[PDB]
Design an enzyme around this catalytic site. Sequence first.
Site, short mmCIF file in Angstrom:
data_model
loop_
_atom_site.label_atom_id
_atom_site.label_comp_id
_atom_site.label_asym_id
_atom_site.label_seq_id
_atom_site.Cartn_x
_atom_site.Cartn_y
_atom_site.Cartn_z
N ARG A 31 45.22 38.02 55.24
CA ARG A 31 45.10 36.57 55.04
C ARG A 31 43.95 36.02 55.69
NH1 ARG A 31 48.30 32.99 51.99
NH2 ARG A 31 49.54 34.88 52.03
N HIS A 47 43.56 48.28 47.27
CA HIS A 47 45.04 48.31 47.65
C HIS A 47 45.61 49.68 48.23
CE1 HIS A 47 45.18 44.23 46.18
NE2 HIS A 47 45.02 45.00 45.05
N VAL A 61 43.48 36.72 49.91
CA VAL A 61 44.61 37.31 50.65
C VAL A 61 44.53 38.60 50.17
CG1 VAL A 61 46.20 35.29 50.89
CG2 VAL A 61 46.01 36.52 48.67
N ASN A 62 45.06 39.77 50.42
CA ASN A 62 44.96 41.13 49.96
C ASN A 62 45.89 42.08 50.63
OD1 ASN A 62 43.29 43.00 48.16
ND2 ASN A 62 43.32 44.27 50.02
N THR A 63 46.81 42.88 49.82
CA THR A 63 47.69 44.06 50.53
C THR A 63 47.09 45.41 50.50
OG1 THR A 63 49.50 42.41 50.20
CG2 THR A 63 50.03 44.49 50.70
N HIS A 109 47.12 46.33 39.38
CA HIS A 109 47.22 45.16 40.05
C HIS A 109 48.37 44.82 41.10
CE1 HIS A 109 47.67 40.38 40.34
NE2 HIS A 109 49.11 40.65 39.95
N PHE A 110 48.18 44.53 42.17
CA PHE A 110 49.04 44.21 43.28
C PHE A 110 49.93 42.80 43.09
CE2 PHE A 110 51.17 45.69 46.95
CZ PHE A 110 51.64 44.68 47.53
N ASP A 111 50.95 42.65 42.68
CA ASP A 111 51.45 41.35 42.10
C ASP A 111 52.06 40.75 43.33
OD1 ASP A 111 51.39 39.63 40.09
OD2 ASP A 111 53.80 39.81 40.10
N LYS A 143 37.70 37.57 49.92
CA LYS A 143 38.97 37.40 48.92
C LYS A 143 40.09 36.80 49.90
CE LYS A 143 41.66 40.32 46.11
NZ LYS A 143 42.51 41.66 45.79
#
Length: 122
Positions: free
Chosen positions: A83, A12, A41-43, A117-119, A39
């Site tokens: 995405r 992240h 989705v990921n930011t 964690h990225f929520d 994966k």
Amino acid sequence: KETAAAKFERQHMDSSTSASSNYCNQMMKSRNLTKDRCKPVNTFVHESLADVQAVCSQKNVACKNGQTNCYQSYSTMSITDCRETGSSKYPNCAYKTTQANKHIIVACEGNPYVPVHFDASV
């Protein structure tokens, strides 16, 4: 073992860049988020590690999973959302790269009290 804190920085953190169309394709691969599957989705956050760590002392909000250890940044942050595309097929994982400026929500734990964690982004 990779620690949850280290895993958060790998998944992240991307301070090197302030905010290309290839970026998610490159980064989702180079950060090992396409090794076992795409994966979905990921930011990535384009702020300093210290500024992201500081979110664990900011606004306490409910996590999506109902846990209480999430924190919302008071300021907006430069982020990139990755995405997976409709047509992406493992192992050739393909992503849409979208830049935004949003408040981040991270889960924090441990001593030191750091992001794990990225929520969400809001």
